[PDB]
Amino acid sequence: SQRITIDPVTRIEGHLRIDCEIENGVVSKAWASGTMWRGMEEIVKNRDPRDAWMIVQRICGVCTTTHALSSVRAAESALNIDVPVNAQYIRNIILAAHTTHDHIVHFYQLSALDWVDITSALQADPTKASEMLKGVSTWHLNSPEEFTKVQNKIKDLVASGQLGIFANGYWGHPAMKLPPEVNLIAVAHYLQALECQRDANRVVALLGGKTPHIQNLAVGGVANPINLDGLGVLNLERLMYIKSFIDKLSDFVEQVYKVDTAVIAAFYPEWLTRGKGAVNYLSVPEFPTDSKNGSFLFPGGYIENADLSSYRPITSHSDEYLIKGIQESAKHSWYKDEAPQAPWEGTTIPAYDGWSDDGKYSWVKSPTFYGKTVEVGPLANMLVKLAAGRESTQNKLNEIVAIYQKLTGNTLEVAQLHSTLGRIIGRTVHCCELQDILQNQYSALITNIGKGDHTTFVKPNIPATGEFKGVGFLEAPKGMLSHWMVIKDGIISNYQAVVPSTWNSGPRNFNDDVGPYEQSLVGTPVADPNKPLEVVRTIHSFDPCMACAVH
Amino acid sequence: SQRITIDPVTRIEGHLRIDCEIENGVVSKAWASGTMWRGMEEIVKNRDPRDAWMIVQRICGVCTTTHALSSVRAAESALNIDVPVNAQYIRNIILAAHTTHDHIVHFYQLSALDWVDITSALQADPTKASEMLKGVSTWHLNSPEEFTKVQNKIKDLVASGQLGIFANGYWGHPAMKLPPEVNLIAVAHYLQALECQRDANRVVALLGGKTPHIQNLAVGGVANPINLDGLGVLNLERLMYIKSFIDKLSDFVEQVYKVDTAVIAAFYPEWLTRGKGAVNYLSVPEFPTDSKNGSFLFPGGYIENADLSSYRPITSHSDEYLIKGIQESAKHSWYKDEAPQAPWEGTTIPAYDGWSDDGKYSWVKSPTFYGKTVEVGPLANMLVKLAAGRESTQNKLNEIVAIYQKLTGNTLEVAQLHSTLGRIIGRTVHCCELQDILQNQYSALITNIGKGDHTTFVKPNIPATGEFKGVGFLEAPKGMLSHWMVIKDGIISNYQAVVPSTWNSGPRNFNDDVGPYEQSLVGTPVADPNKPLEVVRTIHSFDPCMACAVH
Amino acid sequence: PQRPPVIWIGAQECTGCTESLLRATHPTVENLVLETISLEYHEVLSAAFGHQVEENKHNALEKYKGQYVLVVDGSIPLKDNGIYCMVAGEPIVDHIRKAAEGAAAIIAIGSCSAWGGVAAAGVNPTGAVSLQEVLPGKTVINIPGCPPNPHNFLATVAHIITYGKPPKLDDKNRPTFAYGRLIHEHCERRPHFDAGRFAKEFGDEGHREGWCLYHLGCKGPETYGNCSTLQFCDVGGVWPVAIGHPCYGCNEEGIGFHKGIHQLANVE
Amino acid sequence: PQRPPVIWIGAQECTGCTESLLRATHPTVENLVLETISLEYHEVLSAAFGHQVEENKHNALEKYKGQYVLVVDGSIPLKDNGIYCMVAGEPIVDHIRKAAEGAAAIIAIGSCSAWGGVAAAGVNPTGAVSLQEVLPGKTVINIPGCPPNPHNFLATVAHIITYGKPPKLDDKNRPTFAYGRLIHEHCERRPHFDAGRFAKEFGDEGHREGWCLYHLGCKGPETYGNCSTLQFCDVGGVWPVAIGHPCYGCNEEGIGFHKGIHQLANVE
Ligand code: SF4
Ligand code: SF4
Ligand code: SF4
Ligand code: SF4
Ligand code: FCO
Ligand code: FCO
Ligand code: F3S
Ligand code: F3S
Ligand SMILES: [Cl-]
Ligand SMILES: [Mg+2]
Ligand SMILES: [Mg+2]
Ligand SMILES: [Mg+2]
Ligand SMILES: [Mg+2]
Ligand code: NI
């Protein structure tokens, strides 16, 4: 038996430490630790409610857009503002295109090198690699010639003796199971992914004014000026340009990312039987389409004890059942006030005292829902959509399972989705369904402007007396996000962000109950405790973001 | 001691009873009683804040517009809304035109028959009557032929034996001092006044949508759609029509009403020596002209112990010293809670127990300013403008004094304005200065539209939680008006109107101090206790409005 | 010649219904009182006050018994035995019943006297009721609005004088010439309603083109009146909707003072 | 053929400054790391983790002593002995100072490392400071913005590689090609400023004609940058003002994260 530390965990956003006790070659106990704090909730306090979004967007530059959108929704909640529908379409296109970038980069740039051995790709036959994908994908860049060019770039990098960020990786590890050909395919797709994600961010930029960190929001709607006949504003030529980039995303997502997700499952089927983090799941509905902050394209809900049949739907961002259940504890976190706190009454008082296994060991708070630990993010999101009987989600999951079936002769049941690979699958399903969101909301915007509605902004009034509480929910790439604003005497008197990586990465809670990251690791086989690849495989499945978790 | 009751007092708005104790033909003590209550503050509670103005406008149809404008200002105060400047110009034109009609009707239709003996007019020589005005007025309708036509209308009404509303008047009363010729002049002007006041209401109607009870306001601005080029909206043709009626008001106001005010003072100079109601005076600034509910064309302020030289200016409707000083008591009123109440904490709980001289005797509450009794209305308004050194007010008063001096050989000093006639003079000065308000604000509106500003309305948001408070001040024809709105969970939880006739008519207060109507009557000579014309003269000078006083 | 007598009593009135007469042009108020009628009692304009004006009332009720038109503005408060409106020490309901006994015709001018109006809204603090409710044995002519166009009243009185009977009435005893049709069934913005051309907020593009105000809360679909045709003030083009604001339903019981300004009307 | 080595360390970063590289086109991030540089340390992309990646860092600092470009994003927190950012159990200020010792050139990418940025705003909970403040005897090249256009960084690194020296710098050590001019002194809406053609609210008629955003709070008059010329994302026409939102001053110390969105700028 022994104690290891993984610090830093790389190929995540931000600063994470993972500790594990290993007994009889399996993880018996784990600690997740966020090691950097900025105090973004304190920095935004005492300001005008309208200023918060520009400041709190800087909680995170990977999930850029998300904290900006949650912040304006929180102020709108407090102030009772109905957002114009054109502003919802624009916000929705931004969030959907951003999330497409976000998931693609997670699967390829952040996660693939846990499963892919680049050295082994040097042994591949590019023609056999291409042959393996016949009747598996229709993607137009799987030729032997593409794969030979990619193999030659690997060859040249290795030949230079400057491996840089590819150096001292887990090449030949016994947990690396792909054949040489499948390693080479994955590296070719890693490089191709960078083009697709770039196109997704061109959609974001044309509405946001740049990315990272969009600049087109306002409490009350958006700053885009809709005028089909206007010079220098959001006219039909600009909208056509946006559409030209929306149209470029689908083929890579459907013919490369979706197919690779099935192929990794086919080669790593034991990873459908480990990495369960929780038995409870939460998602919020997303992409509102009416004039009153509702009519969501994607549904939300709460699953308890993995029972999809008795889940509780959530159809509103004003749902009092959702609002009243959420608390955070700092018993095992470096803050002073330890009892569970509702976020409108939250404090964030730093109290660093160093690492203690049974005491405080993280800057991440411990969120609960009516006292229970909950997993958020794509696994939650997918399971709630399946519980809701959403045919689009059923159908998209079935496409991944059919590729898995063709490759293995085996099927995938919902029980197998509560796992490291199920989590990855939920993320891919989300990315695929978001391409329909983009087409839907582009069309809705064009149609609405054609009816003569160019409205985008409702100027707020903020009473100079009174105390007003608002909450902004958002289904972010990593899961349910909420920003909680209290307004008193016209300024922010409290601001609390409860972020999806807070839910998943948070340490042991007030009742010493274990959060999703720490739970997911129990039972992980570790072949080589000095090179604990298996632990990082499960942790990456959650897409950690520690700027998000801690803020 | 003799005890009289005057019930009803006619030629006012609403239901008033005046009681007097008379010692040796001199009033020694008086009681003012509002005898009708509706409970308009309770009727408006538990509604959307946006609905209040249409309901509380019905507090009074004589001072129509005033309660509508105070109500939207109160909601805008609570919500922290800055009204568009075009909405201010339109609000201002309506209030100035309305107040022109109001003052003219008060001087002629309500007050003149206290001072004018119609039967004496039958003895007049119309040629002598006309000659008396040579070099006193330039009015074009003072000919002997006009006066003969008017005299013949009186003759015909008397010969019918149906005197109706002229029946059982105070003809030959010893306090009737005008010569026959001046009585006939006054009746001619009484009839001519009806045409001028009709033109003033045509201004109001073209912006309000009708009068009585305008219908163009909103919490957030006005409902008039400004579009110089639009069919069916407020275009240049409509504005030109408004201007055609503004231009018709000046000559009667300047050459008839202003002159008759000087002439009545010249014939009744003892009425410069009685009818003092108070030593403290309050007015609020009025006619805001900036984008932030300020920059008033008329100044406000607080005079204590008749000292103009040390008055306190009031330049803002958010003045904390003004807001904090206002309270009302029901010790001697038919309500339950008797201690002085700030209006945001006000109650209006009816507790009728009949008339008691030393107990409760009125539906009017007793307002105080930091515990003092205060007169409001045109005497206060004029004295505050003189204390401010407003040259327009000094110049206009000087024109009235010059006519008085030509007829009497005597000047008027400010001490003589604290009187029944000073109160009537302050009202006339107001009406005269309002004609320049109308020209100024019409010109401002035309100019601003010409710069490309067609904005009229800022849509409010009303937080669905929290409790917040607003107050709307307005310098009404009868004096300072305030509406006090508390909003809780998005609906009106308290509404209190503190109305100018409440200040002046209210009964003895929590300290048994005497308010302006009651104080003004002490010392009044009463030649005939069965026909107490002298009491009605002083009470009419305050322009009682009991629907306003009581609501 | 002798003029037809009128007795006017205000109960829980705001005086707006009297003030409507000061905007009238046919007749003007001066021609009404000198040529058209003999206004025998009206406390807003009466030279006499107090005991003298109470003498005038009693003398007129006697001299003109069976001949006068009785006009009431304001609601009548029944709560607590009448004490929410006391004139000369007596409840106004007693003054009105006494005057009703000798009336040739009885008119409720304004929504308050016609159906209780604003004074009877909400919790109804004073138990305010209509003139018809206090005179159950009499046919009360109702001329609602807050206030009505004064000529809705003056042409009703003229019909009584000129032709010796009231004008034709609907089943709420309202004159058909003024109240016989829904405002929405004679509204010049109906084409915009039909086309789906709606103002959504004051100052928006549709609003600034004079489009239909239905989605701002216009109550024209559920209010009987002549506001779109006779309009107000005789200058042309002046009524609430033409100025840019929805009808509030002030004529109509259950609409005005009950529904919110922005609450949508039911459409037949 | 050997590529110039780069060591990238994040302190209190949000990762936006690294994410800017994923929008770059000249070079793309894949050409940057395969052709332009050898990225010897970058925790966002590194295959290795934990002990292996701390081996890579120590090996690179030794192998490339005096040769590598050090890049830092994020502020560096000095409060409470550096514990507000701890990597491999040690304060990030110690990792940065150690890497700085052997650096050929040192770049603060983003406002956080250039001047403290958002993380040092308000009450500055963690005592966050700039990279230059932690390295007082070193010349730190500042590339501010939140995040900057990635080519403000990439063309600075290219100048070092191609011509053997940094680009020309202003008195704040910012490259003049990117930060040499006020945004307002090269803004295409300056004609509208000069004419008094201003948006007053988002969605108003001026806003919808592309007028100047000064009265919405535009900080262009007090912010050095290339946002109006180079703009963002290489698609053409994309910067905050062109999309319809004022400049917030995110490049400029004392402006971004200090002044309200709608607070007006001083004009020179
Ligand atoms: S109907 Fe309207 S105008 Fe007439 S008394 Fe009632 S509230 Fe006043
Ligand atoms: S809803 Fe109102 S504005 Fe529209 S057509 Fe009907 S009555 Fe006219
Ligand atoms: S400069 Fe901006 S984008 Fe870069 S680390 Fe700081 S907050 Fe993030
Ligand atoms: S204020 Fe802003 S939008 Fe206007 S010219 Fe200057 S930089 Fe451009
Ligand atoms: N997605 C994302 Fe970032 C995290 N965790 C947020 O919100
Ligand atoms: N003027 C007026 Fe009416 C009174 N008193 C109000 O306010
Ligand atoms: S509110 Fe009344 S005045 Fe006519 S327009 Fe509607 S019935
Ligand atoms: S906010 Fe920043 S990105 Fe440029 S436009 Fe202003 S310096
Ligand atoms: Cl358009
Ligand atoms: Mg608006
Ligand atoms: Mg938090
Ligand atoms: Mg205000
Ligand atoms: Mg009151
Ligand atoms: Ni009044």
Comparing CB atoms, the residue among B15, B208, B238 nearest residue C85 is B15
3-class DSSP state for residue A504?
A: helix
Chain D partners of A169 at a C-beta cutoff of 8 Å? 47-48, 52
- Is the CB of A452 inside 8 Å of chain C's CB atoms? yes
Which letter does DSSP use for residue A230 in this model?
-
Give the experimental resolution in Å: 1.4
Would the annotation count A60 as a binding residue? Answer: yes
Chains in contact with C, counting 3 or more C-beta pairs less than 8 Å apart as contact: A, B
Strand pairing of C105-109 and C140-143? parallel
The two three-digit tokens of residue A275, written as one number: 């990495």
B81 to chain A nearest CA, in Å? 6
Q: Where are the beta strands (DSSP E) in B7-125?
A: 16-23, 26-34
Residues of D in contact with A221 (CB under 8 A): 202-203
Phi, psi of B95 (to 5 degrees): -65, -40
Distances (CA, A) of B184 to A132, B118, B151, B466: 116, 7, 7, 62
Domains and CATH numbers, chain A: 2-550 (1.10.645.10)
- Closest by alpha carbon to B528, among B170, B180, B166? B170
User: In ligand 8, which atom is closest to the CA atom of A210?
Assistant: 3
Tell me if A456 and D203 make a contact (CB, 8 A cut-off): yes
The verdict on the CB of residue C82 being under 6 Å from ligand 7 is no
Interatomic CA distance for residues B81 and B70, integer angstroms: 14
For B224, name the nearest residue in chain C, comparing CA atoms only.
C244
Ligand 6 closest atom vs CA B504: 5
List the single best residue of B77, B291, B317, B461 to mutate versus A (max A Cβ within 10 A). B461
Q: How far is B413 from chain C (nearest CA, A)?
A: 32
CB A181 within 8 A of CB A88: no
Please classify residue A489 by burial: count the beta carbons closer than 10 Å to its beta carbon, then call 0-12 exposed, 13-18 middle and 19+ buried.
exposed
Return phi, psi of residue A484, to 5°: -120, 110
CB burial string A362-384: b at 16+ within 10 A, e below: bbbbbbbbeebbbbbbbbbbbbb
For residue B456, the chain C residues in CB contact (below 8 A) are 202-203
* Contact call for A225 and D232, based on CB within 8 A: no
Please give the Cα distance from D247 to D218 (Å, whole number): 5
| Ligand 5 and A272: CB distance under 6 A | no
Q: Do A211 and D13 touch (CB under 8 A)?
A: no
User: Would the annotation count A545 as a binding residue?
Assistant: yes
CA of A507 to the centre of ligand 3 (A): 26
Ligand nearest to the CA of A449: 9
> What SS3 string covers C110-156?
CHHHHHCHHHHCCCCCCCEECHHHHCCCCCEEEECCCCCCHHHHHHH
Coil vs helix vs strand at A418: coil
In sequence order, the 6+-apart residues with CB closer than 8 A to the CB of A7 are A16, A17, A18, A35, D50, D87, D88, D89
Tokens (6 digits) for B411: 């000047």
Residues B200, B104 contacting (CB under 8 angstroms): yes
A16-23 and A26-34 beta bridge pairing: antiparallel
Instruction: Report yes or no: B469 at the A interface, CB cutoff 8 Å.
Output: yes
Assign C104 to helix, strand or coil: coil
Distance A117 CA to ligand 3 centre (A): 33
DSSP string spanning B500-551? HHHHHH--S-TT----HHHHHHTT-B-S-TTS-HHHHHHHHHT--BHHHHH-
Q: How far apart are CA C20 and CA C149, in angstroms?
A: 7
Mutate to test the interface with C, among B47, B58, B538 (most CBs of C within 10 A): B58
| CA-proximal residue: ligand 7, atom 4 (nearest) | C227
- Closest among A88, A80, A91 to A470, alpha carbons compared: A80
Q: Tell me which residue has its CA closest to atom 6 in ligand 3.
A: D112
CA of B64 to the centre of ligand 14 (A): 7
| Pairwise CA distance, residues D202 & A225, whole Å | 7
For residue C205, which residues of chain A lie inside 8 Å, CB to CB?
452
Q: How far apart are CA C244 and CA C201, in angstroms?
A: 10
How many Cα atoms sit within 13 Å of A51 on the Cβ side?
23
CATH of the domain at D17: 3.40.50.700
Which amino acid does the sequence have at D245? H
Asked if B462 reaches chain A (Cβ–Cβ under 8 Å), the answer is: yes
Tell me C79's DSSP state. Answer: G
Q: Are strands B16-23 and C140-143 parallel, antiparallel or unpaired?
A: unpaired
Q: For residue A461, give the nearest of B80, B467, B469 by CB distance.
A: B80
Q: How far apart are CA A102 and CA A109, in angstroms?
A: 10
Nearest CA in chain A to D10: A14
What is the full DSSP assignment across B286-322? EEE-STTS--EEE-EEEE-TT-GGG-EEE--TT-HHH
Torsion of CA A204, A209, A214, A218, to 10 degrees: -120
Q: Which residue range is the domain that position C20 belongs to?
A: 5-175
Contacts by residues A188-191 (CB-CB < 8 Å, ≥ 24 positions apart): A188/A141, A188/A142, A188/A146, A188/A147, A188/A150, A189/A108, A189/A256, A189/A257, A189/A260, A190/A108, A190/A109, A190/A112, A190/A116, A191/A150, A191/A153, A191/D30
Hey, what are A289's tokens?
Answer: 């389409």
| Binding region of B | 60, 63, 545, 548
The answer for D 46-85 residues in CB contact with A (under 8 A) is 46-53, 55-56, 75, 77, 80, 83-85
What is the experimental method? X-ray
Q: How far is the CA of C14 from the centre of ligand 1 (A)?
A: 6
Of A460, A461, A467, the CB nearest to B466: A467
Residues of the binding site of D: 14, 17, 112, 146, 184, 187, 212, 218, 227, 247, 250
Q: What are the chain A neighbours of B78 within 8 Å (beta carbons)?
A: 463
Measuring from each residue's beta carbon to the nearest atom of ligand 8, which residues come in under 6 Å? D 145-146, 223, 225, 227, 239-240, 247-251
Give the other-Cβ count within 10 Å of D257's Cβ: 25
A67, A473, A542, A545, best to mutate for ligand 5 pocket (most atoms within 8 Å of CB): A545
Cβ contacts of residue D180 below 8 Å, gap of 6+? D170, D224
C85 belongs to an annotated ligand binding site:
no
The distance of B456 to chain C (nearest Cα, Å) reads 6
Q: How far is A229 from chain D (nearest CA, A)?
A: 9
Q: How many CA atoms lie within 13 A of A212 on its CB side?
A: 27
Q: Which ligand is nearest to the CA of C153?
A: 1
Q: Do the Cβ atoms of B218 and C202 come within 8 Å?
A: yes
